[PDB]
Design brief:
With 268 residues, the protein is an alpha+beta fold. Strand 1 and strand 2 form a beta hairpin. Helix 1 runs antiparallel to helix 8 and helix 3 crosses helix 4. The radius of gyration is 18 Å and the shape is globular. InterPro entries: Beta-lactam/transpept-like (IPR012338), Beta-lactam_cat (IPR045155), Beta-lactam_class-A (IPR000871), Beta-lactam_class-A_AS (IPR023650), TAT_signal (IPR006311). It comes from Xanthomonas campestris pv. campestris. This is Beta-lactamase.
C-alpha cells in the first residue's frame, strides 16, 4: 500500500504542480541520517540563503583567531542597497562584525553581507570555505544584488537541496565550527525575523525552528531550516527551494508553508 514516504513525496509533487516551476526539497534526519527529497540533486539559485554560509565562513575565521567579532566595519553611503534594516540606520558610522552577521542572518541585511564578504575572501573565498567543509556543489560567485540573477542552466550562486541540507548538518551539528560558533549561528537562525510566512507557518508553536529565507521578488522563494520536533532525539534539517514559480508572492510563501505542513503531518 501507500506508505508515509509515498505520501510525503506526493505532497511535495502536488505543491510543485500547483506553483509551476521547480520545487526542490530535502529532509535530513540528523539522528539517523535518513534522507528524502524532491529534485534534491538539482541546482537552484540560493538568493539570501547564501547568508547562512557566509556567516558560518566568518565564524570559521573567528574560530582560528584570524578575525575579531568586535572589529568595527565602516558603513558608507555607497554601501547602501534596498533592503538594509540594520545597516541603513548606521550610514556614516560603524558596526561590529558580530552585529553585521546578526543583521545579515535575522534581517537578511544586504549591505551587511556585502561588508562581510571581503573578510572571508569574497565569493571565491566563500566557495573555498564550502569545499573545505565537504560541500562539493554549493558555489558563491557574486555579491548582492547581482547574485540573485538566474536562468535555467546558470551555475553561479547555486546550491542543491541535498547539498544544503548536508551543509546545515555539518555547520550546526558537526565539528566544522567550534562550540561557541555553532551555538551563535544556531541562535541567529532561531531569532530570524524574515520567515514568519514560510516553513515556520506550517509548524506547531512548540517546535523549535531556526531558518534563513531567500527570494528574488518575482518567481523564487527559498527557506532552509533546522527543526526540533518535541522530544525527538535529534533535529531535522529541511531545505526548500522554489524557482520559476508562476503563482504570486503570497502563494510562493504558502507553498513553503505547505512543505513544512507535510513534514509536520507525516514525520512528526
Amino acid at each position: 500500500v501507500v506508505n508515509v514516504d509515498d505520501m510525503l513525496r506526493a505532497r511535495w509533487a502536488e505543491i510543485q504542480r500547483g506553483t509551476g516551476g521547480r520545487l526542490g526539497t530535502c529532509l535530513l534526519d540528523s539522528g539517523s541520517g535518513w534522507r528524502i527529497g524532491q529534485r534534491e540533486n538539482e541546482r537552484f539559485p540560493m538568493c539570501s540563503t547564501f547568508k547562512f554560509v557566509l556567516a558560518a565562513a566568518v565564524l570559521q575565521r573567528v574560530d582560528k583567531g584570524e578575525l575579531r567579532l568586535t572589529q568595527q566595519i565602516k558603513i558608507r553611503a555607497s554601501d547602501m542597497l534596498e533592503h538594509a534594516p540594520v545597516t541603513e540606520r548606521h550610514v556614516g558610522g560603524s558596526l561590529s562584525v558580530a552585529e553585521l552577521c546578526q543583521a545579515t542572518m535575522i534581517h537578511s541585511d544586504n549591505p551587511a553581507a556585502n561588508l562581510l564578504f571581503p573578510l572571508i575572501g569574497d565569493p571565491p573565498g566563500l566557495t573555498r570555505f564550502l569545499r573545505g567543509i565537504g560541500d562539493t556543489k554549493t558555489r558563491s560567485d557574486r555579491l548582492e544584488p547581482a547574485m540573485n540573477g538566474f536562468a535555467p542552466g546558470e551555475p553561479r550562486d547555486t546550491t542543491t537541496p541535498a547539498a544544503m541540507a548536508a551543509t546545515l548538518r555539518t555547520l550546526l551539528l558537526g565539528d566544522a565550527l567550534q562550540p561557541a560558533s555553532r551555538k551563535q549561528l544556531t541562535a541567529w537562525m532561531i531569532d530570524n525575523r524574515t520567515g514568519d510566512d514560510c516553513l515556520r507557518a506550517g509548524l506547531p508553536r512548540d517546535w523549535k525552528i531556526g531558518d534563513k529565507t531567500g527570494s528574488n521578488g518575482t518567481d523564487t522563494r527559498n527557506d532552509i531550516a533546522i527543526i526540533w520536533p518535541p522530544g525527538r532525539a535529534a533535529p531535522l534539517l529541511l531545505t526548500a527551494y522554489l524557482n520559476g514559480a508562476t503563482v504570486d508572492a503570497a502563494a510562493r510563501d504558502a507553498a513553503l508553508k505547505a512543505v513544512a505542513e507535510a513534514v509536520r503531518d507525516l514525520v512528526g
